Amino acid sequence: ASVHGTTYELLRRQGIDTVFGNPGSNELPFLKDFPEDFRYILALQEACVVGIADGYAQASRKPAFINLHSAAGTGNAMGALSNAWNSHSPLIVTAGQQTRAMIGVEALLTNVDAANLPRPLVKWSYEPASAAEVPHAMSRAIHMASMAPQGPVYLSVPYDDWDKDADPQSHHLFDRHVSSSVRLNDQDLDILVKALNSASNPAIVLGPDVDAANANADCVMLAERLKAPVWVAPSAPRCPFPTRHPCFRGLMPAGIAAISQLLEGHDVVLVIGAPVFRYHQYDPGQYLKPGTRLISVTCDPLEAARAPMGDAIVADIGAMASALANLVEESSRQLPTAAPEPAKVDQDAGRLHPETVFDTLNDMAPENAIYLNESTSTTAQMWQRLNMRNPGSYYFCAAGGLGFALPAAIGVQLAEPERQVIAVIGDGSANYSISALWTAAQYNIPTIFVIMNNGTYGALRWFAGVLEAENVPGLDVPGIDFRALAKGYGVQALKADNLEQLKGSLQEALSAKGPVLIEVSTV
Amino acid sequence: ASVHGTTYELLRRQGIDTVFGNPGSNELPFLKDFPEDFRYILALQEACVVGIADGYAQASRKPAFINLHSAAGTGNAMGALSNAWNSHSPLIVTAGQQTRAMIGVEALLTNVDAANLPRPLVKWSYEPASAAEVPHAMSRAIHMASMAPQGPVYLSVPYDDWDKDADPQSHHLFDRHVSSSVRLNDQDLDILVKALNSASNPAIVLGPDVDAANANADCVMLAERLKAPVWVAPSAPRCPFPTRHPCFRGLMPAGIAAISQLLEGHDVVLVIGAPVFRYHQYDPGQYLKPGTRLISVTCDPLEAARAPMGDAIVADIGAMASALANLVEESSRQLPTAAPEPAKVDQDAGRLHPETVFDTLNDMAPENAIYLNESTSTTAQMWQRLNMRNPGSYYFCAAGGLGFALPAAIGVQLAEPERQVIAVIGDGSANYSISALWTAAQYNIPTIFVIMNNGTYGALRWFAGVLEAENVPGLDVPGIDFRALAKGYGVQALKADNLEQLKGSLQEALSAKGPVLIEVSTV
Amino acid sequence: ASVHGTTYELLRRQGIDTVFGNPGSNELPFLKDFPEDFRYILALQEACVVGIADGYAQASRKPAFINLHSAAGTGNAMGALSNAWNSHSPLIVTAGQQTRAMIGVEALLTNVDAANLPRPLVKWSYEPASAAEVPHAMSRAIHMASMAPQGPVYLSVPYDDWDKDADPQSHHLFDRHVSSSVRLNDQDLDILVKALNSASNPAIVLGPDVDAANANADCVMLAERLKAPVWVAPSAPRCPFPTRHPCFRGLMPAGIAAISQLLEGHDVVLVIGAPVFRYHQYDPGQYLKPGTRLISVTCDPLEAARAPMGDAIVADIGAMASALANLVEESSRQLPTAAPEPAKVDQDAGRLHPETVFDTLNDMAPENAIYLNESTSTTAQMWQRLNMRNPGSYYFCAAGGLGFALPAAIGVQLAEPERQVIAVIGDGSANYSISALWTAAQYNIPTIFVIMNNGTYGALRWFAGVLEAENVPGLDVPGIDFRALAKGYGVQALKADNLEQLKGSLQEALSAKGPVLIEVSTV
């Protein structure tokens, strides 16, 4: 069999049936005779291709396969890979290389020093030394992406390799099963459980890896047994806990001093599935106040190594969450009281306050809706106003790289056809991956995009305010008609200048049978 | 003085007065108190930022300064850097890094292993070890970008460095002058000149570095003295010779066998300012046929090293071109006869043949117009139908990375306010950097964008045809309304469905006082 | 023809006839059927292999070819490559890789991510994508190493490639000639010459690249014409000027303040072939005092970029030195007076003062002797006491990496059979590459090794003294019998405990017909 046939069989046998890409000439030999049981999802720019694959992978909880064009295609996708790295997204990125006969002369489209291009944003990067090695290299890519800590991998393949004969021994790769579903040994696990049972005032902090492992329900049980408040680690890329559960305490502020102050009084703080800690603003102070012991369970050695305080256990989040939830004793402490409902902000008949938008979305959206957030100055309000009861209900660019939510919303909707996806995106952020709209229109993926139009890079004007920075250029983005942009890409567009219109537009959008974009005029 | 003040003085003293960027929080400390004698050009996505800076640098023939946001901003610009590498574009790319106090914990927005991110697409990449080193590092960046062979450089700067005190000895950096304007020593130059004077049937092949050095006029003189035909090296990123000059022979096909066949009979082939050779399609054969001696003058050691045949001289193109043009004897051979005018293709009243579009542009555009090409399946026709008499009249993505022409056209227009820029872009290519349109509208840069709409990735369907590849998915891009996209970004839009409309639209576009986009329905 | 035959023909045609190496299994396929016109020089450890090749290349002024074993062999040679990088040594380092069929499974002896191993100490690093590409890759290696700025390159080759068929078009590589013998254009050169003719008190500073280019004589003429004092740039790896010439001023101290103080009063300082400046100790102060203008001529863009002051011209040192020496006017100023003879230090009948050793060597050694220095605490005395009239008379580890002089002395002696090589090495430094002695014995290369035995890492005890550092462990190296070590490797050994014995031992050593090691007891 050819390398082409062998490789598609490998993919199919490993559960991959979809290719997200933007084609090029070095990739034609791979894409020809495309298998009938496969599905190709085209996007117009590489950041969009990867963003869609990313949302698809995160929501489906399985690896996504991507095919890009040489160095330029790969380069266009590197901002998206920064987010994928931080979110532990299992992405298999393949790029076509020039024919081996012309790599040396560096003919046009040659990806020079290929493996180094995507570094340091990949777990593994490689270009095979011969055509017969391709299936084996593809196998390595699949497993490296899937093993904890999951992350993106890169494989460059010269286009002339596809038609060559594959090693007949490649059949051994087809059904390989690799597992990293491990947990702390019995003896040490018993010690940890005892420390938890003995704590007088424990607190639990959860990160994105909990939602990735679908360990949400196990963490709820753990929180209920320990009768402990639960916080979501700062700069949260996903939501790991039902936001209206009595133990829920909200999103932690992303500052050193703010967090230690928040945890003061808690003798034992158990952090699960999050780095310690994804701070953002520089808020100097103590990492932890005296009297607090921190224990971290992470699926990533890099996270365990860099934590500036506490103990750590490197293991599978799902396996650990399940073990802990079943072994801890039920505390006789009283279960925490639920946080009160957020207040209603005064809303006149003019432009909409973000709070109003979120309250309305919470009112009108189905209970199993999935939200994506790329409205940077309104994140805190969004977290307090949306009741997200189920796992996989929230996504936000893990590395803070804009251009994620719009395409990712399409990938998530593709992965969860029965849950309405609603992406809330700022007018500034909307531009980074605007062409992704075309993919939703073409495949009729019913994502709803809500553009928060305030005409400025709000979050930046805010930091520009703290630093007390003046005369900073480039903070405003006036003159963009989002309805026209949506029309350009074949997506139905609506406008909301006030509350009445907002409610009407949402009613229509929710009843639509295709993707819809709503431009909202915000304060 | 602070690092901030010292750095802006360094830039100003080295001739930089414009910053192309997309702001972020790590960059606010650098951008605050923005100098009044500077100019900030905002673009909505990083590929667009770099593309604009690239066009500006290439057209002005001086380095362009760029400021991006951390890893995500840098990553979004890597496809654009692939083109910049191939075009020897002097680009100074700076990105903001997290505060030194939080780099270790990898707070959000930390650019991890920063210097490795842009590799291998940069000449030099670096992150200073202390704040006082910043001005010196900036100096290194400026010079590394400007010395032959020119190319992009990268500098990552922690945001807390800007307000620190600079080394008082930094003043020594302000007026440093670095030169690489060198040419072959007298003795060896005399030998080369003798070889040229002795040739019986010489041919000259010119590359992009000739136009970059503005050595066009010197090459015309050289060609006239030697009475030799002149070809433009394959995959041409720029036009180095007047296309209607009697010696002009056109664009060389990008294949090994095709080129050796084309050069057969020429005893001495002098290649100036081009790699040997930027092949594209695999057209196996002899690199050179017996009887042909090839001599290459390149400004790049990497080019000299990888040439599979001939001798090479590594030197400044301008200095070499000038020396050769003045030292060679006037041959008694007859000057080559000009190529005949291309034929008029039959055009009915329906959709436009690309040939018709180019003939019409040639008819109506000013004689000093500048063209950008990102209509991949029509490159050969474009080269035969446009009379480009002046230097800096043509640009095409040097690494074949789409998303270059649209933003680059804006940068070129900014650099040459008195020459009408006309970008000819395919409907597929238009999407990669569509948001750049906003920048033209906002600063009122009068670029004319001609979108060749044929609804498909034409060049790919063509390769898919040669390889005799079937069942290749993702080759069509239907359902895009370019007039709506232009409206979305504030740019006047026109449509041309036939010749009559094409002529009318061009008349209007040429008389416009701002940017204009014309969607052309092509066959 | 096979890749094996084609490659040896390429090497032979490019002037390479010697292979320096330490064999391994991945290299057997390359070494088999070793050409009869070639010469293989075996060394017992890789640092020794590279050190010998380095000395050979530096002294012969042509590239040296090296063959090492996979990652371990390459790794053992990386300290030696650090020196080669700093000395601009043209070294072609090749390493054998596992068979392509087993690279993927990482069988024993696989060099993983090969090209990244030697970085950042190489100009170019690469592993071919196919066997037919090997000759072309070898060609690139040869030229990259030879073009200015010269430096080490690395090529990894899977062992199964050698027996495959080579591309018949590879014959084009055989006689390629690449030149970088360039100099500043006429107009700018005239400006520089005028600045030199107009200077009232010029000073000249020379670096290692002057000796590498054999531009010594041209610099003497330049100094005599300008009637200017000449200094050797700090941390000198080579000697670029006759040390007893009336203009000679000695080795510059390696400190910022010390150098500016030394140059004070000189209006124009011309630096040729040296970085600006290879400082060592931290001696904070002004880089240059007011009134001094510095102009640097360097063959390295990296040097021009990082200079913290002055203008720079990037060009070939030989071409530039020759041009300047012939164009400057003869100044009417009086020629500088020669420095007085160094004083005789008092020497009793006990252990030898380093000054005594150097005076005696100067007295007894032939006038065309070549010295290598790796006696770190005695460098200043050595420079003042040895009259070195000819080019290529001195070598010192360019990156300060010990283990250079002993093997390099063998390589230099091999390159210059008619000039007596005398390596002066400290007892600490002698151990790093002690096994190199075997190579001298086996091929009967008559190098004389003088071991300065003082039982301690003297230079370190000295820095430990300045820093006023106390309780520093590991500074003494007692209990080493160098005569026994020499005997172990087959080299004649002598001992000198006092002056009488020193003179006697030197008389014998100079008359020897093979390598000799003299252990000298120093204070």
Ligand SMILES: Cc1ncc(C[n+]2csc(CCOP(=O)(O)OP(=O)(O)O)c2C)c(N)n1
């Ligand atoms: C790729 C990328 N480029 C630039 C930035 C810097 N940045 C962070 S927030 C922001 C503002 C986003 O504006 P918008 O989406 O309109 O939302 P707002 O702040 O107004 O809520 C910008 C440009 C970024 N994080 N990522």
Ligand SMILES: Cc1ncc(C[n+]2csc(CCOP(=O)(O)OP(=O)(O)O)c2C)c(N)n1
């Ligand atoms: C960043 C990038 N992505 C993908 C490609 C692959 N590619 C080469 S030509 C091409 C078609 C461009 O289509 P279009 O601009 O409509 O012009 P046409 O071929 O129809 O003339 C594509 C997608 C590329 N070279 N660069």
Ligand SMILES: Cc1ncc(C[n+]2csc(CCOP(=O)(O)OP(=O)(O)O)c2C)c(N)n1
């Ligand atoms: C590979 C390497 N290891 C360690 C050092 C650090 N070092 C610099 S000088 C020195 C002392 C050398 O001792 P010796 O050769 O006996 O000479 P002395 O200082 O006594 O004159 C040492 C160990 C070095 N420069 N290179």
Ligand SMILES: [Ca+2]
């Ligand atoms: Ca409500």
Ligand SMILES: [Ca+2]
């Ligand atoms: Ca906004």
Ligand SMILES: [Ca+2]
């Ligand atoms: Ca005409």
Ligand SMILES: [Ca+2]
């Ligand atoms: Ca098209």
Ligand SMILES: [Ca+2]
């Ligand atoms: Ca004497």
Ligand SMILES: [Ca+2]
């Ligand atoms: Ca010693």
Ligand SMILES: [Mg+2]
């Ligand atoms: Mg990289």
